[PDB]
Design an enzyme around this catalytic site. Structure first.
Site, PDB file in Angstrom:
ATOM      1  N   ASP A  21     -41.079  31.942  -2.011  1.00  0.00           N
ATOM      2  CA  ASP A  21     -40.507  31.279  -2.865  1.00  0.00           C
ATOM      3  C   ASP A  21     -39.881  29.476  -1.740  1.00  0.00           C
ATOM      4  O   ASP A  21     -39.690  29.391  -0.652  1.00  0.00           O
ATOM      5  CB  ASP A  21     -38.414  30.921  -2.990  1.00  0.00           C
ATOM      6  CG  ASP A  21     -37.496  30.377  -4.061  1.00  0.00           C
ATOM      7  OD1 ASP A  21     -38.680  28.672  -4.207  1.00  0.00           O
ATOM      8  OD2 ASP A  21     -36.846  29.959  -4.358  1.00  0.00           O
ATOM      9  N   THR A  22     -40.806  28.402  -2.506  1.00  0.00           N
ATOM     10  CA  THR A  22     -40.672  27.429  -1.068  1.00  0.00           C
ATOM     11  C   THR A  22     -40.098  26.546  -1.816  1.00  0.00           C
ATOM     12  O   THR A  22     -39.843  25.262  -0.822  1.00  0.00           O
ATOM     13  CB  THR A  22     -42.938  26.488  -1.884  1.00  0.00           C
ATOM     14  OG1 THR A  22     -42.331  26.242  -2.875  1.00  0.00           O
ATOM     15  CG2 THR A  22     -43.751  26.966  -1.579  1.00  0.00           C
ATOM     16  N   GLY A  23     -39.651  26.621  -2.719  1.00  0.00           N
ATOM     17  CA  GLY A  23     -38.011  26.136  -2.624  1.00  0.00           C
ATOM     18  C   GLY A  23     -36.621  26.136  -1.975  1.00  0.00           C
ATOM     19  O   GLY A  23     -35.735  25.563  -2.396  1.00  0.00           O
TER      20      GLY A  23
HETATM   21  C1  LIG Z   1     -36.607  25.957 -12.743  1.00  0.00           C
HETATM   22  C2  LIG Z   1     -36.657  27.036 -13.594  1.00  0.00           C
HETATM   23  C3  LIG Z   1     -37.230  26.969 -14.970  1.00  0.00           C
HETATM   24  C4  LIG Z   1     -37.084  28.891 -15.203  1.00  0.00           C
HETATM   25  C5  LIG Z   1     -37.004  29.900 -14.679  1.00  0.00           C
HETATM   26  C6  LIG Z   1     -36.535  29.335 -13.298  1.00  0.00           C
HETATM   27  C7  LIG Z   1     -36.263  30.511 -12.586  1.00  0.00           C
HETATM   28  C8  LIG Z   1     -36.879  28.760 -12.311  1.00  0.00           C
HETATM   29  O1  LIG Z   1     -36.001  28.394 -11.120  1.00  0.00           O
HETATM   30  C9  LIG Z   1     -35.035  28.627 -11.428  1.00  0.00           C
HETATM   31  C10 LIG Z   1     -33.943  28.414  -9.954  1.00  0.00           C
HETATM   32  O2  LIG Z   1     -33.266  28.713  -9.590  1.00  0.00           O
HETATM   33  N1  LIG Z   1     -35.729  29.560  -8.803  1.00  0.00           N
HETATM   34  C11 LIG Z   1     -34.749  29.549  -7.265  1.00  0.00           C
HETATM   35  C12 LIG Z   1     -35.030  30.759  -7.030  1.00  0.00           C
HETATM   36  C13 LIG Z   1     -34.949  32.110  -7.764  1.00  0.00           C
HETATM   37  C14 LIG Z   1     -33.769  31.970  -8.191  1.00  0.00           C
HETATM   38  C15 LIG Z   1     -32.597  32.741  -9.425  1.00  0.00           C
HETATM   39  C16 LIG Z   1     -33.695  33.532 -10.039  1.00  0.00           C
HETATM   40  C17 LIG Z   1     -34.927  33.295  -9.503  1.00  0.00           C
HETATM   41 BR1  LIG Z   1     -36.307  34.598 -10.710  1.00  0.00          BR
HETATM   42  C18 LIG Z   1     -35.258  32.478  -8.565  1.00  0.00           C
HETATM   43  C19 LIG Z   1     -35.430  28.861  -6.823  1.00  0.00           C
HETATM   44  O3  LIG Z   1     -36.563  28.629  -6.333  1.00  0.00           O
HETATM   45  C20 LIG Z   1     -35.214  28.275  -4.878  1.00  0.00           C
HETATM   46  C21 LIG Z   1     -33.301  27.105  -5.342  1.00  0.00           C
HETATM   47  C22 LIG Z   1     -33.270  26.433  -4.266  1.00  0.00           C
HETATM   48  C23 LIG Z   1     -33.916  25.120  -5.751  1.00  0.00           C
HETATM   49  C24 LIG Z   1     -32.796  24.828  -7.064  1.00  0.00           C
HETATM   50  C25 LIG Z   1     -33.921  23.828  -4.834  1.00  0.00           C
HETATM   51  S1  LIG Z   1     -31.934  28.842  -4.847  1.00  0.00           S
HETATM   52  O4  LIG Z   1     -32.532  30.222  -5.373  1.00  0.00           O
HETATM   53  O5  LIG Z   1     -30.434  28.694  -6.022  1.00  0.00           O
HETATM   54  C26 LIG Z   1     -31.720  29.056  -2.974  1.00  0.00           C
HETATM   55  C27 LIG Z   1     -30.973  27.917  -2.330  1.00  0.00           C
HETATM   56  C28 LIG Z   1     -30.242  28.820  -1.807  1.00  0.00           C
HETATM   57  C29 LIG Z   1     -31.652  29.212  -0.255  1.00  0.00           C
HETATM   58  F1  LIG Z   1     -31.218  29.170   0.773  1.00  0.00           F
HETATM   59  C30 LIG Z   1     -32.184  29.695  -0.805  1.00  0.00           C
HETATM   60  C31 LIG Z   1     -32.407  29.894  -2.489  1.00  0.00           C
END
Ligand SMILES: Cc1cccc(C)c1OCC(=O)N[C@@H](Cc1cccc(Br)c1)[C@H](O)C[C@H](CC(C)C)S(=O)(=O)c1ccc(F)cc1
Ligand SMILES: [Cl-]
Ligand SMILES: [Cl-]
Ligand SMILES: [Cl-]
EC number: 3.4.23.16
Lengths: 99, 99
Positions: free
Chosen positions: B25-27
């Protein structure tokens, strides 16, 4: 381009004639932007993240550029913590993960 | 490898002797896994994003294997809906975004 991950992969996008900063997020199925005006009709959508689900507006066939690469596709709008480019547009611009 | 984004980039990891599936997850700034035991000291942290925040335990200097690539880094443990490999460990395996 080739983008390393020592810092957030933030890029400039263009949508509605305006430049915005957004995160390339392979963890995101779809693209979601901060509240903004877009043309046309929208449809309801639920997206799930780390804390739970939010409601967003779904706009289809919207012109958007990502680091200058022109794309046309679905854009969600809602209370996202940051503008996120998700796999629907990353695939369109030919993005892959490599190691 | 080169990983396509047509589908979620799920990969096998190994940690604490356990094999698990996780999202590249690059995000994500950091790595967060579903509830599990890990060795050593830890400190509480809150992480958040779409749908809000969750409380996690932060463990540092944890060995992990991602697609056969060895890495060491911080691992967050808590009620995440999916296992996430974030940038802190993606860098170590040399992972880049390319288009
Ligand atoms: C934007 C979007 C549209 C449709 C479906 C999805 C899954 C989606 O992404 C939502 C999102 O919040 N993705 C997260 C990773 C994630 C989280 C929960 C379920 C799934 Br499946 C995928 C995003 O890539 C990463 C986030 C951050 C993003 C919102 C900037 S995070 O998870 O809040 C995170 C925060 C801090 C950390 F240290 C690690 C992870
Ligand atoms: Cl609605
Ligand atoms: Cl699309
Ligand atoms: Cl780390």
């Amino acid at each position: 381009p080739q983008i390393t991950l020592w810092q957030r992969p933030l890029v400039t996008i263009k949508i509605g004639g305006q430049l915005k900063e957004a995160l390339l997020d392979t963890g995101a199925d779809d693209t979601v932007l901060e509240e903004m005006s877009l043309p046309g009709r929208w449809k309801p959508k639920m997206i799930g993240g780390i804390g739970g689900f939010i409601k967003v507006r779904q706009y289809d066939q919207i012109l958007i550029e990502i680091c200058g690469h022109k794309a046309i596709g679905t854009v969600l709008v809602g209370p996202t913590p940051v503008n996120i480019i998700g796999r629907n547009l990353l695939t369109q611009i030919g993005c892959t993960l490599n190691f």
